[PDB]
Amino acid sequence: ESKVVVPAQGKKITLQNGKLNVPENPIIPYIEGDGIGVDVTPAMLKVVDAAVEKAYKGERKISWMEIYTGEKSTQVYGQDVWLPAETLDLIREYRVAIKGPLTTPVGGGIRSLNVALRQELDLYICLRPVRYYQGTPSPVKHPELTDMVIFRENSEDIYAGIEWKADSADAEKVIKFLREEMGVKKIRFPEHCGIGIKPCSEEGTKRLVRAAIEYAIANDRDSVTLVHKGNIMKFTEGAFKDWGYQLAREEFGGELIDGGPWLKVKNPNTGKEIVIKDVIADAFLQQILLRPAEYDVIACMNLNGDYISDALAAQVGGIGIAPGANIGDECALFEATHGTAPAYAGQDKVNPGSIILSAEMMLRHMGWTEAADLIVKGMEGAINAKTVTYDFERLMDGAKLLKCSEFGDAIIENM
Amino acid sequence: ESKVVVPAQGKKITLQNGKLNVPENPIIPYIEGDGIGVDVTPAMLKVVDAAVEKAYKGERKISWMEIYTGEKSTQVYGQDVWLPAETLDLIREYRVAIKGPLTTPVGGGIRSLNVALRQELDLYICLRPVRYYQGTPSPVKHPELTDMVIFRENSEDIYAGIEWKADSADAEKVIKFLREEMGVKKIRFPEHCGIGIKPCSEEGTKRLVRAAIEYAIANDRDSVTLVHKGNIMKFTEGAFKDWGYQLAREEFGGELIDGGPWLKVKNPNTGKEIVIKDVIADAFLQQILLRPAEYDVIACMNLNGDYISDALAAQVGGIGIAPGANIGDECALFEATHGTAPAYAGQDKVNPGSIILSAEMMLRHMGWTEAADLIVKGMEGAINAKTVTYDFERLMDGAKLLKCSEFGDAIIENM
Ligand SMILES: [Mg+2]
Ligand SMILES: [Mg+2]
């Protein structure tokens, strides 16, 4: 029944002792993505192929394999198949995959497909690196001061999707339990009240922060900031902050700075002292504008990560080019972060920067750093050449308007 | 036992049929506020007195009455009295009060005093008007495009303070109920898991949005945008959005624009069609930078309001001068929005702009619009004269550094 055709030439990536074993001909699954995925994905495929072809001079080559999810899944596999079991099986099986913009339909009680993928594959790490690309028009005066890496927790928080509708039997049942058995007196209006649950575990926190610190060490980053709203949500957000610092101490030998609360972890490979600190979420949102240079690697919960990532993107003018990744212990799915933009779908005019940069993250994740570097090199040259897509062009003077595909080429030309 | 001395000259404000009856000599309670409250409050008192003295030419006069809350409450009433019952009684009794920056101690299991005040007095409306003041240094290129009014829900959300600590008996009890009786399977890690509850009621939503729309009408504002994360939290954030639009239809005759989802409410007094729309929270955080002019009156839940208000403030360079108000059906408490800054406490160097502007909101709320206008007029002249405090001065060239008190005078001089 499967419509997924595995490439004749191509070998599956394997995982052993926590390290990926990537052949020179890896099979990489890809989900086109709804809307503009039809435009961005082809550009991504061409630039990636160019990047690897150039980097390894024909020695290596990715064997792309199309898998389905979203609007296209229904057209391929049928009426109500928005996310086939095989897609989860395939991504897991092939360890590394990429996808275009996805959307979840309303009216059928279906929940976020993007979240379905993250949660079902236990892709607990949402990696969002936000940096500025010289030349990109931005709403701020000094976007270049932004060079941060977002480590957003992907398996917990209010995002779990645990909630009950107002007036429904369950909502009543839960509220009754809360007020009567839990002695909750802080529910301002118990009647006609929708209830949501916000979970946070020590293990969930530890693995995220652990991934963030290990990243700072690996990339010789200056600090890791734990963002949270612990002053209000002590047992969830405050706990995240507590466990974050605790992990820094327990596993990385973090020592106290001054009289607290900041810790310092000596990079075992560079001798550099990485600062482990924290800031309240609402203040952080101000500090990213006021003092962006003071920050680097960020570790936060699901919802905050969502907001923080979007805010950072907007500032540097990367709302349409922000790369993203969902990493887990067995597999990883890279994705275009922007929406589907159905109105422009098919016009070959949208900016492929997001998906392409996410593919650069993909290559780097596969250890193909030379190819990854070629993509970022291309991006910088193209953007800096003011030869861009409409979204950039409309905010500039003397820029050359390029089509989605044409921008792809521009990147290739600048490799 | 009370140490609160009521002014001999002065009359209490009364409320009838929803309207305040403010005498020419109203008694207005004020809480100094911890830290820099010691600096900002005196400046606020002097500027307000100057404003009213000038506006009404001696006819009217506020009789300030000091009440206590926070660090000062303990020094006045005793060891563990951070928030005396009389403070809540007094604010309620006098209908209108103002306060400096407040802080909640850690280690004693005490929860946010600021929230204690809002929730206990049922001050369900957190009004945060964010506008730019020509002259204030800002991190963005066009802060002048920001002229928004934030209507943040104050009695519900994850802010209610409903939560249980990881490994505690209650947390286990709740999680057990959730998994076993509620059939919850989305809790990634049930063990060592802190749990929080996020409530949202139809009534809580209706009164907030109702206050927001009535405000747009009263001030002839262009639109009301409902911010939310309904695509993930359907039964809480999505519900807020649903009830918001429903209210617009049910009580203000909102008609559909195009094919939805936007509605239009004709201002009964101006004939202007106010647009009722919505945007996902994370996108809004980007849209405030990218398209600030497209927005005006915002209606959102507690947590989002916190983030949105802080973000807007930072952009326009008003992190230290953003006014705020907690409005309810019986009383209202205006407040300095910034933190206490204990390090500068007593130095007479902090910017009093926040508390002063919050006092301008206070005067306007009392119907003393002439005095309110004098304060904003003073603010504009002082700021525009580049005769400012350190926080502004440090980011400018050729500006005259002024002390906290001195800036107060500058405002008065510009009335
Ligand atoms: Mg998003
Ligand atoms: Mg705050």
Curated annotation (Swiss-Prot), chains A, B:
Keyword GTP-binding (UniProt): no
GO molecular function, one term: magnesium ion binding
Amino-acid positions noted as binding Mg(2+) in the UniProt annotation, renumbered to this chain: 306
Positions that bind Mn(2+): 306, 310
Notes on activation and inhibition: Inhibition of this enzyme by phosphorylation regulates the branch point between the Krebs cycle and the glyoxylate bypass, which is an alternate route that accumulates carbon for biosynthesis when acetate is the sole carbon source for growth.
Protein family: Belongs to the isocitrate and isopropylmalate dehydrogenases family.
Residues recorded with modification N6-succinyllysine: 99, 241
Post-translational modification: Phosphorylation state of this enzyme is controlled by isocitrate dehydrogenase kinase/phosphatase (AceK).
Subunit structure: Homodimer.
Annotated coiled-coil segments of the chain: none
Gene assigned in the entry: icd
Cross-referenced PROSITE patterns: IDH_IMDH
Cofactor note: Binds 1 Mg(2+) or Mn(2+) ion per subunit. Both Mn(2+) and Mg(2+) can be used, but Mn(2+) is 10-fold more effective than Mg(2+) in vitro at the same concentration.
Main enzyme class: oxidoreductase
Amino-acid positions noted as binding D-threo-isocitrate in the UniProt annotation, renumbered to this chain: 112, 114, 118, 128, 152
Name assigned to this protein: Isocitrate dehydrogenase [NADP]
Record site feature (Critical for catalysis), residues: 159, 229
UniProt signal peptide: none
Enzyme Commission number, as recorded: 1.1.1.42
Effect in UniProt of substituting residue 112 to A/T: Decreased enzyme activity. Loss of phosphorylation
Effect of residue 159 to F: Nearly abolishes enzyme activity. No significant effect on substrate affinity
Chain positions with N6-acetyllysine modification: 141
Effect of residue 112 to D: Loss of enzyme activity
